[PDB]
Design a protein around this ligand. Structure first.
Ligand SMILES: CC1=N[C@@H](c2ccc(Cl)cc2)[C@@H](c2ccc(Cl)cc2)N1
Ligand SMILES: CC1=N[C@@H](c2ccc(Cl)cc2)[C@@H](c2ccc(Cl)cc2)N1
Length: 86
């Protein structure tokens, strides 16, 4: 069975605002809901669509960055892990 992870309060609140309805998730599920949030908030750069703008959004504080690239996967996993229960 795939390992389930447990978002801490702020990430959990974001995930549920995006439609999530449980407390533990596979990493694939966490990433899915985050992608939905980013899409819904229109955070992608208009010309460089790999870039997510966080400087005007609470996601910036959650991840601790101003922009990130969807192509930097290790970085994204790290930003999520800081928001998972150890
Ligand atoms: C969950 C997801 N599906 C893709 C998509 C792509 C286009 C559309 Cl219309 C819907 C979903 C992608 C996306 C969303 C927005 C942008 Cl700017 C770039 C990539 N995110
Ligand atoms: C273009 C695209 N690829 C997916 C992905 C899936 C996994 C990873 Cl590590 C990167 C991009 C998804 C995404 C983007 C950003 C986040 Cl935070 C979550 C999901 N959007």
């Amino acid at each position: 069975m795939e390992k389930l992870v447990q978002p801490t309060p702020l990430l959990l609140s974001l995930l549920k605002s995006a439609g999530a309805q449980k407390e533990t998730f596979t990493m694939k599920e966490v990433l899915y809901h985050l992608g939905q949030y980013i899409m819904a908030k229109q955070l992608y750069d208009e010309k460089q669509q790999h870039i997510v703008h966080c400087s005007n959004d609470p996601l910036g504080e959650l991840f601790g960055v101003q922009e990130f690239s969807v192509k930097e996967h290790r970085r994204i996993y790290a930003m999520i892990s800081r928001n998972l229960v150890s």
